[PDB]
Design a protein around this nucleic acid. Structure first.
Ligand SMILES: [Cl-]
Ligand SMILES: [Cl-]
Ligand SMILES: [Cl-]
Ligand SMILES: [Cl-]
Ligand SMILES: [Cl-]
Ligand SMILES: [Cl-]
Ligand SMILES: [Mn+2]
Ligand SMILES: [Mn+2]
Ligand SMILES: [Mn+2]
Ligand SMILES: [Mn+2]
Ligand SMILES: [Mn+2]
Ligand SMILES: [Mn+2]
Ligand SMILES: [Mn+2]
Ligand SMILES: [Mn+2]
Ligand SMILES: [Mn+2]
Ligand SMILES: [Mn+2]
Ligand SMILES: [Mn+2]
Ligand SMILES: [Mn+2]
Ligand SMILES: [Mn+2]
Ligand SMILES: [Mn+2]
Lengths: 99, 106, 79, 94, 98, 106, 86, 99
DNA sequence: ATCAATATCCACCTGCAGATTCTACCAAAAGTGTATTTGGAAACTGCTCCATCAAAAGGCATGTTCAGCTGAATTCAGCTGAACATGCCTTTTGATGGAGCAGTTTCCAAATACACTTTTGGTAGAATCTGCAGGTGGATATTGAT
DNA sequence: ATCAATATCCACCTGCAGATTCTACCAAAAGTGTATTTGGAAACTGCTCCATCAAAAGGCATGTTCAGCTGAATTCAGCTGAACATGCCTTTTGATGGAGCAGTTTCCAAATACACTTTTGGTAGAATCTGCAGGTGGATATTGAT
């Protein structure tokens, strides 16, 4: 009976959808709960402005979107279309995030 | 004045306010009269150059609101502005649309 | 943990914006580790600004300043 | 409680190049950041120039040099034309 | 005529510290040039960050409290912990006498 | 007189650092403690580099620390490396490092 | 009272010199096109630093590029150099 | 009869030699000539302090050595032991300082 | 390459809440008019330091030869990762109170800046010391052919 | 499994260039003594934020199937490394002329310093508009069967 797109076509459509949009891609509550756990190891009983956490999220996603561009390039360099941990690790060594 | 420092430099940007901001910014012991004039002009110019290209993004999208998306598109598609802001993030700006050729079907 | 709330689809969505077509299985965990270091480095600094101002509330600016000295300037929160 | 901003000046410039277009609150927040970023870049560099050269004054000559260091080729050239043009008009004015 | 101006430097002090941690070791002038560049670099990073703090927080004075924050921002952690102890100990000592 | 360096139990010149801060366009005013504190830190990071660098000299059976010993010291320590990650030690060379795949096989 | 015209000097960055830099970098084997590619990458690097250094020189109304002008140029490109002053 | 080391063994011998020294690797005079040629296209009749040229060489060599380190990792990433221009370009793009 | 046959985008419209723009006031900046300083530009000018030169000598770049071993090209199996239907639950959302606290004022004890004035510590050559760079020559480890 | 063939280590020596030590002049800390600030220390307010509350929705965790890619295995042409003859040209080392840093004075165009006067931008509701949430319906592109 059913319909089935070939593997990779829903993927490209998702690539097009999300590159033409600007909404935040990590859902709000899990991110805010992440942010407060990490903050707590540095300083306790901390309050946050909504905008502070909103900015923290804007930066993380922008950083991660960028890292996936660079990882992608590394993947393709080794004749793959799949990003693997070794690709992320190479992009950060070249960005000096590893030094 | 009856006519202000901005207008006497033929500017929109605040010569007077930029002079104060320079003086209170721990930059140098003294600020010449010509410095905020010169700085306001450049800042007005770079602002003009951006809003120019960015309005064009909104003309294309047929909405006459410039939103952060239009600044981003505007900025990232201009090579010199891209270089100027290569380490900057436009919040709610997204990315330029681009898919690497190898990834396309056929 | 709380890190686990960064889900497969979310990590997947970001890679899409990044132009990625196909994603190895170990990525989502690898990406979780990268996001944590990032968040840590920023938050350590963001809070250092907070403590210095003798405050108990991290402000947007505290984050902005933290991002700037990390070479990652952010526009849109300086007001 | 007074919060200063560049918004009015950014809006004047917008209408001048695109009279029929407006701008969203958060696009405005971006424009303020940009203006506060390049201000800081240029002024900061002019500070270093006057320092290296044992001068206690930031004159337009340091603003120009700063602009030449901080901006890409074609973008720098116009900015220097504008600055020089504003100063001379300002000196003519009074 | 024409007195050739003194060029100040950190070398004498670098060497005192060199002798404290390594009494039988010396240093080439071109290694000392590396050390002078280092002291001036870190000097600027800290003062610059100290400048921003006092500015952000609307204070017209850079106190030791602004130096410390800058040190915590600018240094990796184990190095920062120690830098802070030395600094805190130098100031309290400075205040205790004279 | 009684010296400000010795009054702080320091080798680095508290007074000169006071002048450098007052005349360096950092703030309108400088606290009495700030150059004491800053001198302490500068003196400490210096001790820490000269410590590690002396070891490099003794390892290499040299009496005098040369820029190579500085580089080895800096690049081999995880925290000084990060702190000077964007710095170049002239005449310092690099750390011996040959990627495993490049060594002879079979 | 003169200076013979300087031409085509990027070519003095020789193949063997490029090999030697690559060795310090840990490179075992080198494609034939690496050496022309490196000259082009080096020329961009040099131009950018030299352009800035001279902007510092001119601003000081000097006709001599000093090491400090060069140090200052390296600094603003995020490539701080130790061993030459300031 | 005569002796011949296997291909790649002298290359490795050189990696060690050059990684244990700190000497400049570009010939001194030809480099100074490159610097003056380029300066002259920007502003004419410029003099140089001797230290100015040595600082420029030191920066250029440290930069290129560094760039060769990153270029090698990209080569190894694509299962090669040979650096090719696509490797320099990939390393330069990431570390987006330049491309 | 074609035809059918779903599936998803993308245009072109709509009604209304959520923003933007619009008015009217007003502290707080920006401006004015005068009165005084003063940083640094111009003008010598004493001297480092740069630019050239000249030559002798060897270190090292070029251009060549020849084959090893690397990169590029092909094929393919297996196992990973995409696509989807199912149904559960974590995240949204829409107000509601209470509180913790970031924000402002308003005084002062303590702390900082300044102009002089008195005191060393730090610097620039001289005047001594002394590593270590070059130069040998003999022991040891590594590499590659048989 | 072993030896020629090299390369790499590793010491030992000595004179000399390059660090250390020594002195004396002296700028700049350091001391004195008023002149000004300023960063808080209590006492207060209006807000964003945290704590809860508590139903519904769409997004996500799960499990199944199968296409298509990654990694392995093979093969081979030709590119790049090793080795060398040749000779150019970089490196050394010194000298010399002079351009142009860098030091000193002198003295205004420019900057500061005040007392008042005007303008302006920020602010907060009133009077306007504008995207978007939703909804087709046609265009566009995908997938499978011949
Ligand atoms: Cl030319
Ligand atoms: Cl192979
Ligand atoms: Cl081939
Ligand atoms: Cl199959
Ligand atoms: Cl829509
Ligand atoms: Cl219907
Ligand atoms: Mn002027
Ligand atoms: Mn203090
Ligand atoms: Mn030319
Ligand atoms: Mn007056
Ligand atoms: Mn007077
Ligand atoms: Mn004067
Ligand atoms: Mn030849
Ligand atoms: Mn003495
Ligand atoms: Mn030796
Ligand atoms: Mn002259
Ligand atoms: Mn005089
Ligand atoms: Mn108005
Ligand atoms: Mn409408
Ligand atoms: Mn919609």
């Amino acid at each position: 009976k059913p319909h089935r797109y070939r593997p990779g076509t829903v993927a490209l459509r998702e690539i097009r959808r999300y590159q033409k949009s600007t909404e935040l891609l990590i859902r709000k509550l899990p991110f805010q709960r992440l942010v407060r756990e990490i903050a707590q190891d540095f300083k306790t009983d901390l309050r946050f402005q909504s905008s502070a956490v909103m900015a923290l999220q804007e930066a993380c996603e922008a950083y991660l979107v960028g890292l996936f561009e660079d990882t992608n390039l590394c993947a393709i360099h080794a004749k793959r279309v799949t990003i693997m941990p070794k690709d992320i690790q190479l992009a950060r060594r070249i960005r000096g995030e590893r030094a | 004045k009856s006519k202000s420092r901005s207008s006497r430099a033929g500017l929109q940007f605040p010569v007077g306010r930029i002079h104060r901001l320079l003086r209170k910014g721990n930059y140098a012991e003294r600020i010449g009269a010509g410095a905020p004039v010169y700085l306001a002009a450049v800042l007005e110019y770079l602002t003009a150059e951006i809003l120019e290209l960015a309005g064009n993004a909104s003309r294309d999208n047929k909405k006459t609101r410039i939103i952060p998306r239009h600044l981003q598109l505007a900025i990232r598609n201009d090579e010199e502005l891209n270089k100027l802001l290569g380490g900057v993030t436009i919040a709610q700006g997204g990315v330029l649309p681009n898919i690497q050729a190898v990834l396309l079907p056929k | 943990d709380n890190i686990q709330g960064i889900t497969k689809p979310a990590i997947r969505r970001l890679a899409r914006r990044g132009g990625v077509k196909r994603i190895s299985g170990l990525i989502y965990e690898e990406t979780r580790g990268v996001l944590k270091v990032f968040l840590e480095n920023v938050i350590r600094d963001a809070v250092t600004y907070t403590e210095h101002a003798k405050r108990k509330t991290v402000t947007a600016m505290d984050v902005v300043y933290a991002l700037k000295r990390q070479g990652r300037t952010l526009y849109g929160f300086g007001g | 409680s007074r919060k200063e901003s560049y918004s009015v000046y950014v809006y004047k410039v917008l209408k001048q190049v695109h009279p029929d277009t407006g701008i969203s609150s958060k696009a405005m927040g971006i424009m303020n950041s940009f203006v506060n970023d390049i201000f800081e870049r240029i002024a900061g560099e002019a500070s270093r120039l006057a320092h290296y050269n044992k001068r206690s004054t930031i004159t337009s000559r340091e603003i120009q040099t700063a602009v030449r260091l901080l901006l890409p080729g074609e973008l720098a050239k116009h900015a220097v034309s504008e600055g020089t043009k504003a100063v001379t008009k300002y000196t003519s004015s009074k």
